[PDB]
Design a protein around this ligand. Sequence first.
Ligand code: HEC
Length: 108
Amino acid sequence: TEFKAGSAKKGATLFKTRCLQCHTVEKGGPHKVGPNLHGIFGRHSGQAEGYSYTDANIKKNVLWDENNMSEYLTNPKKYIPGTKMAFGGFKKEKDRNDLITYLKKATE
Ligand code: HEC
């Protein structure tokens, strides 16, 4: 719709430098500050096992699809008030395009 693929290698690195601190993407990868992100697309928020998500994340019951992840990536707190995710966001659409590209390939 409003989602455009960019670079997976670029996105791989945005992840490492901006998301790796609190999340893993691999299947069998563990939860850390953040929950493991394997299989997140198609998935609704707050459903990873062994993970304690805020009341905020839970009740948002957001269906993770690439378009959705873009709004969130711009301003998670604005997008999900009450969330403990400590990420200020991606204001540049290319950044978001590029990371979603990566996530879409890495989390499947
Ligand atoms: C790099 C920009 C990041 C991406 C992609 C994601 N995050 Fe995080 N994140 C953090 C916490 C503590 C939570 C849980 C929130 C709560 O329980 O209130 C999250 C949550 C997410 C989610 C939603 C997960 C779901 O199953 O619904 C996604 C898609 C997500 N995060 C992607 C913490 C952190 C964090 C620690 C300081 C960082 C750097 C990031 N998150 C960055 C990213």
